Amino acid sequence: HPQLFKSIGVKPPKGILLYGPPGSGKTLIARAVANETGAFFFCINGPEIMSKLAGESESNLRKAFEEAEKNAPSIIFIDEIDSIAPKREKTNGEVERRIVSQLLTLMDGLKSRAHV
Amino acid sequence: KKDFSTAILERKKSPNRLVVDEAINDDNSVVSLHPATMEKLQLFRGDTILIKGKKRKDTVCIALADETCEEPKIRMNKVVRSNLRVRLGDVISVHQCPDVKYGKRVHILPVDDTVEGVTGNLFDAYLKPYFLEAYRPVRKGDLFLVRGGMRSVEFKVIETDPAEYCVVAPDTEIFCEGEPVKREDEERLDDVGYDDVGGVRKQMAQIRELVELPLRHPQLFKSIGVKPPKGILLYGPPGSGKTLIARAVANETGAFFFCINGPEIMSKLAGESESNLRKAFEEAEKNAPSIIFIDEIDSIAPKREKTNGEVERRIVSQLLTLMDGLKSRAHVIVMGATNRPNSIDPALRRFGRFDREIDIGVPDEIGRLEVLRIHTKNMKLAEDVDLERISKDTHGYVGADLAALCTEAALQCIREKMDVIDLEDDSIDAEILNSMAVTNEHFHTALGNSNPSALRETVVEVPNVSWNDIGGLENVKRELQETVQYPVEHPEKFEKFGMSPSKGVLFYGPPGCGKTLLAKAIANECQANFISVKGPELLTMWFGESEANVREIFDKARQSAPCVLFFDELDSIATQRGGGSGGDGGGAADRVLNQLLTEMDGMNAKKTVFIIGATNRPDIIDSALLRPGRLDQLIYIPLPDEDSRLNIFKAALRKSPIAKDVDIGALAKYTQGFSGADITEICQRACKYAIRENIEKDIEKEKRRSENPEAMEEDGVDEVSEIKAAHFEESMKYARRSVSDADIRKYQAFAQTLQQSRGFG
Amino acid sequence: SNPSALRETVVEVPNVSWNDIGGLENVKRELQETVQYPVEHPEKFEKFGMSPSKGVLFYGPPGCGKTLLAKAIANECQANFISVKGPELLTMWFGESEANVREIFDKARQSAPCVLFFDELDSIATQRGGGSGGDGGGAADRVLNQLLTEMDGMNAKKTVFIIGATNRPDIIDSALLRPGRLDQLIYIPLPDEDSRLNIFKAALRKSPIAKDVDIGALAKYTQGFSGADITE
Amino acid sequence: ICQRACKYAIRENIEKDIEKEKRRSENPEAMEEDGVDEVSEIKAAHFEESMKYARRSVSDADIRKYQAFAQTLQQSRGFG
Numbered sequence A: 001h002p003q004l005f006k007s008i009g010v011k012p013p014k015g016i017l018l019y020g021p022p023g024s025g026k027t028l029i030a031r032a033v034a035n036e037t038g039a040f041f042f043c044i045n046g047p048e049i050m051s052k053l054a055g056e057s058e059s060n061l062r063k064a065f066e067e068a069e070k071n072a073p074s075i076i077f078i079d080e081i082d083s084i085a086p087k088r089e090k091t092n093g094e095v096e097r098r099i100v101s102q103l104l105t106l107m108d109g110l111k112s113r114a115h116v
Numbered sequence B: 001k002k003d004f005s006t007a008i009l010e011r012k013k014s015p016n017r018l019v020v021d022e023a024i025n026d027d028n029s030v031v032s033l034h035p036a037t038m039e040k041l042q043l044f045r046g047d048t049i050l051i052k053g054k055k056r057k058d059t060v061c062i063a064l065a066d067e068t069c070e071e072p073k074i075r076m077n078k079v080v081r082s083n084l085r086v087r088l089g090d091v092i093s094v095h096q097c098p099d100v101k102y103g104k105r106v107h108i109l110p111v112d113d114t115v116e117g118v119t120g121n122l123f124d125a126y127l128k129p130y131f132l133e134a135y136r137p138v139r140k141g142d143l144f145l146v147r148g149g150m151r152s153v154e155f156k157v158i159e160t161d162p163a164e165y166c167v168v169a170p171d172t173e174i175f176c177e178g179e180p181v182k183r184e185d186e187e188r189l190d191d192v193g194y195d196d197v198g199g200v201r202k203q204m205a206q207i208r209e210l211v212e213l214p215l216r217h218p219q220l221f222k223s224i225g226v227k228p229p230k231g232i233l234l235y236g237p238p239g240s241g242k243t244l245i246a247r248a249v250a251n252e253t254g255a256f257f258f259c260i261n262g263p264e265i266m267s268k269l270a271g272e273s274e275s276n277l278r279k280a281f282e283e284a285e286k287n288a289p290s291i292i293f294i295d296e297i298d299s300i301a302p303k304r305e306k307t308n309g310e311v312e313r314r315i316v317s318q319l320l321t322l323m324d325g326l327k328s329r330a331h332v333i334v335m336g337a338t339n340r341p342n343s344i345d346p347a348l349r350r351f352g353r354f355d356r357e358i359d360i361g362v363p364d365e366i367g368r369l370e371v372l373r374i375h376t377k378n379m380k381l382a383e384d385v386d387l388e389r390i391s392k393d394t395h396g397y398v399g400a401d402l403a404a405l406c407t408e409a410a411l412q413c414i415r416e417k418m419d420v421i422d423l424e425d426d427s428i429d430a431e432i433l434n435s436m437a438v439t440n441e442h443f444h445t446a447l448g449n450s451n452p453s454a455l456r457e458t459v460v461e462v463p464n465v466s467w468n469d470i471g472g473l474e475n476v477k478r479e480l481q482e483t484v485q486y487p488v489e490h491p492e493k494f495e496k497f498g499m500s501p502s503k504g505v506l507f508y509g510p511p512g513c514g515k516t517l518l519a520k521a522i523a524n525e526c527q528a529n530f531i532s533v534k535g536p537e538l539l540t541m542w543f544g545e546s547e548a549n550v551r552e553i554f555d556k557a558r559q560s561a562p563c564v565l566f567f568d569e570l571d572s573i574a575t576q577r578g579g580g581s582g583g584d585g586g587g588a589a590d591r592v593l594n595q596l597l598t599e600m601d602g603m604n605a606k607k608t609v610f611i612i613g614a615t616n617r618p619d620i621i622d623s624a625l626l627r628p629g630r631l632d633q634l635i636y637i638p639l640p641d642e643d644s645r646l647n648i649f650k651a652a653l654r655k656s657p658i659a660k661d662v663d664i665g666a667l668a669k670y671t672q673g674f675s676g677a678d679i680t681e682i683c684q685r686a687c688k689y690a691i692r693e694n695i696e697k698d699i700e701k702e703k704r705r706s707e708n709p710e711a712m713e714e715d716g717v718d719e720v721s722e723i724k725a726a727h728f729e730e731s732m733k734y735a736r737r738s739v740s741d742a743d744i745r746k747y748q749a750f751a752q753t754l755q756q757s758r759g760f761g
Numbered sequence C: 001s002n003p004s005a006l007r008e009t010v011v012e013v014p015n016v017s018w019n020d021i022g023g024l025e026n027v028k029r030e031l032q033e034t035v036q037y038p039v040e041h042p043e044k045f046e047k048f049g050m051s052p053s054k055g056v057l058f059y060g061p062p063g064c065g066k067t068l069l070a071k072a073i074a075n076e077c078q079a080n081f082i083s084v085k086g087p088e089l090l091t092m093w094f095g096e097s098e099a100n101v102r103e104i105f106d107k108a109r110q111s112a113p114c115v116l117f118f119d120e121l122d123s124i125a126t127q128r129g130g131g132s133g134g135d136g137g138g139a140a141d142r143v144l145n146q147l148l149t150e151m152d153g154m155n156a157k158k159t160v161f162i163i164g165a166t167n168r169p170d171i172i173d174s175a176l177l178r179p180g181r182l183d184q185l186i187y188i189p190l191p192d193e194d195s196r197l198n199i200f201k202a203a204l205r206k207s208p209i210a211k212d213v214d215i216g217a218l219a220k221y222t223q224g225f226s227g228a229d230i231t232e
Numbered sequence D: 001i002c003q004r005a006c007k008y009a010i011r012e013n014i015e016k017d018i019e020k021e022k023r024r025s026e027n028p029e030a031m032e033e034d035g036v037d038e039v040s041e042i043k044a045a046h047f048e049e050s051m052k053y054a055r056r057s058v059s060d061a062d063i064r065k066y067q068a069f070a071q072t073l074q075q076s077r078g079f080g
């Protein structure tokens, strides 16, 4: 129902961060919402993206974002952001910095909405 | 004289610019002036004039005359004003167009939102009848509204021949050329202008003086002979409006823009960033004048110690080498946004590189009100939104948090109306989908449902606490005035005697008497920026950030002169250096004390930045802080007496109703030597007893009325409910003083120890 | 089987009501008019102008009915009750460390309204005297200052109440008694003859009692006994 | 003491200046008379006012302590 937000004039939020104890139902809640709302759900696992070779991880993330923006409406359930985007107290891994910056750039370029 | 620190923003009066307001005539190409305006401008009947508005927008309109119009107003209708991106009460320039040049290969196409369910043909019923031989001036891109019946069809002028502007003559051969322009054209709603940045009127003034003047007036700088600065480095709390200010000042000036991003460059693989930066700079230089906004510059040039990465070092070196090469003087201005001035690699702070630094701090009360009024110009507000109280309630909210608050308020307003709307489909009724106006209750709910983001930030403020609501202490007030205001307000007269006043005061006395109140009041009266720093904050931030705060506090106090820096609770750190001290905590306390002593020996050398400290027990204070300079001046804050107690009682009860039989003088005589804050606690306890009595009475009356429904509304209504003598009698009997006679005797003993001048009476 | 998240924080509404305690009638009235009214009837105070006080320090003999009082007031207010003891802060100072205390207040801020409770303050609120400071064993230098800094920011929030308890009112530092940080002080006394009668009735409410036992005789016998001793 | 006298003198100077300005403002018919601001030197009244508040930075025991610490190094006094 985008009509309400068109009439009252507010941009709906475009990001949710579920956090809680490990094994408490976060993935289940996300999957239930995706299946109940009938949207084109898309899953990006943490270690799965982080386990691939250099250069391939950015390609996978870019492909996933483009595919989600291709079949609007869509959802991109990034899983375990702790693994792929850790807190940067001190790190030197070039692949880690590249993947974090790629995620930031894609997230900030997502502002063209199209129900993502 | 005038304050010229913000001398660029204000307009200059001219007989060529007028004010915009409403009119009567409703033709798409007419505006009604007063004949005196035409006489002053040497304009006549039927002339087609050019109107120039905000964000470099302009149009052509036919100017007619009427006596009802006022000379300083233009009487602009709604459609043209919408095309000019202005509102009533703004300034619009006027000129004359010599070349009408009726168009030949014009193009006129409609808009999607008005052709939905269109009645049918628009060529022979909407376009030709009202624009053939109409001689209406037309400018490319104008969204003009026409009616060929009940339906109003907006039209966008895709193309004209001549391209800029023309007149719709019968020579125009175009029909409704099929394609309706979608609303996406207004999706890029002319990006950001200047009215979309509000709350900061000095930082924007500095940015304008550094950017818009070099790129639009090289004559002044060439005449004076000064080399204008290139590097600019915005910084402030995250989400406070840095990128927005940069876009506002770069899009309004009309210069070539180039928005480099931090992670965007960093995301690319090694060996490409070094090429991307060089290509970006070489492209920007080629299109003088040029602005290069490098967002999140802290990501691509971090502190070298904090990275120890080869690729990071290489990209930093490439950036430095490129930046030093901007001396071509080809009007290339670099603006590197960040949020921590201490986290940037210091090699970028040298001369030639980023050297001007501007702090986009958190907005104040008027700033928050202005941000709210800017953001709520689209929501369907109700007729009871009181934004002044909303702005006053919110403290520590940066602009982004205020935008989130407005969005949350609208979401709450939608949620409150969830009873009627279904879930399978929507659009149950236009009227039901209408109304739903956001009232004050939604704003209160959203304010209670949200959190700030700048509570820990040092709020360099200008307190509103005046001399009043303190009471008594006339001698201390006058001594503080002579110590503070005169060296700031009249610095030239002290040169006549050549005796430079000191730059420190110490406040010692019983715990709680208005020690911070006097400092805040004098800062308010001098209108100097006030900074409140406490001992616990420094002690915890030492372990938080490895003592990278104490120098920063003095730097932020020095960059805002005049300033009355205030240290509260020196008793934690400023204790004398005992011989039995030990441990990490004592070491940290002594390190903080020594760092403070080192900084005060340079901040009190010059620059006239005032320092006032307050301590609860003076004899335990280290004797280093009483040497000449630093905190030499000593002031004792006494316990208030009967007259002062009456004054403070009146100040406390000024904001609350009081019964006329409560002899406040009898309360003053009732108390003796109380600790200032205990009087406020007595007032609060009286208020609590009064509230309990009033709520009990109301609940009993409601229960009585519910028990007997037939008892209609009697004359009994809630009165003023003044705090009567019973409340004070019940409260004062629970009084518990905070300072025993031993503490005041110790303070008096110390005061007399210092006051060796007792024999000079 | 054993839980995997037993060490997680506690956010709940305790089931203890006024009837679970007895003898503290005046303290019941005072706590009601200090906690319940400022949240459930807020606009009256701005009607009178002066703002209420946020924070209450209980002091009394060990085991005399302090924690039960906080539970009861949280139940009456129907606000989330977050309980953080003394040693937990010290052991987290070497776990999550510096940010840990902040996190607690954040979970107090996001779960408004709340009644944050600090028991065993004597372990951390030792006075900042001449012998204060010390190494990592002297947490009174770090956690006390961090707690003061965090507590000075809660004044802005309308309803996040702070309650502390301590058995050693003498050793408590003086920075926790200035207005803005635990302004009010309440003395929780040892239950007296009527109070001991009520507490014995409350303790034995859950179990059958023989017909030959007189509660009054036990109450007169047990004069000077705290609540924990009656329960024992 | 000298700085206190200077500050009191500047207080007197600003008070006199504002008094003259108010007198001129009242009945603005009063033109620019010959009462121009004088040298405004520090007067004996200012010094006497300041003297009544000056403290004493050295007690009666520290002087004797320093004298003893010096005298223990001056043990040739008995043979001088």
Ligand SMILES: Nc1ncnc2c1ncn2[C@@H]1O[C@H](COP(=O)(O)OP(=O)(O)NP(=O)(O)O)[C@@H](O)[C@H]1O
Pocket: A021, A022, A023, A024, A025, A026, A027, A028, A029
């Ligand atoms: N709140 C819940 N309601 C119903 N089933 C649940 C709930 N939480 C967990 N489960 C079930 O428990 C199992 C594991 O939960 P799952 O949602 O897969 O873990 P998770 O919380 O996603 N793990 P983590 O990534 O550590 O947060 C599944 O079979 C779920 O159906």
Ligand SMILES: Nc1ncnc2c1ncn2[C@@H]1O[C@H](COP(=O)(O)OP(=O)(O)NP(=O)(O)O)[C@@H](O)[C@H]1O
Pocket: B196, B197, B198, B199, B200, B237, B238, B239, B240, B241, B242, B243, B244, B245, B295, B296, B337, B339, B371, B374, B398, B399, B400, B403
């Ligand atoms: N002073 C301001 N005036 C008007 N709008 C503002 C102001 N400050 C922030 N905003 C609003 O804040 C929203 C987003 O803030 P923005 O200025 O984009 O964040 P930022 O501070 O640039 N982020 P970063 O570069 O990550 O520090 C926009 O919708 C702006 O309208």
Ligand SMILES: Nc1ncnc2c1ncn2[C@@H]1O[C@H](COP(=O)(O)OP(=O)(O)O)[C@@H](O)[C@H]1O
Pocket: B469, B470, B471, B511, B512, B513, B514, B515, B516, B517, B640, B648, B651, B675, B676, B677, B680, C178, C179
């Ligand atoms: N004479 C007074 N006039 C106005 N307010 C007072 C006075 N004395 C005490 N107070 C009140 O007492 C409170 C604390 O007093 P203060 O002197 O700030 O204590 P401290 O010196 O410990 O900071 C203030 O909020 C103030 O409103």
Ligand SMILES: Nc1ncnc2c1ncn2[C@@H]1O[C@H](COP(=O)(O)OP(=O)(O)O)[C@@H](O)[C@H]1O
Pocket: C020, C021, C022, C023, C061, C062, C063, C064, C065, C066, C067, C068, C165, C198, C199, C202, C203, C227, C228, C231
């Ligand atoms: N008024 C009371 N009614 C019932 N039990 C009480 C009462 N006061 C204390 N108790 C008993 O005291 C115990 C809890 O004491 P607590 O409040 O934790 O004291 P402390 O905080 O000193 O440990 C409970 O087991 C309870 O049975």
Ligand SMILES: [Mg+2]
Pocket: A023, A025, A026, A027
């Ligand atoms: Mg999971």
Ligand SMILES: [Mg+2]
Pocket: B242, B243, B295, B296, B337
């Ligand atoms: Mg930015």
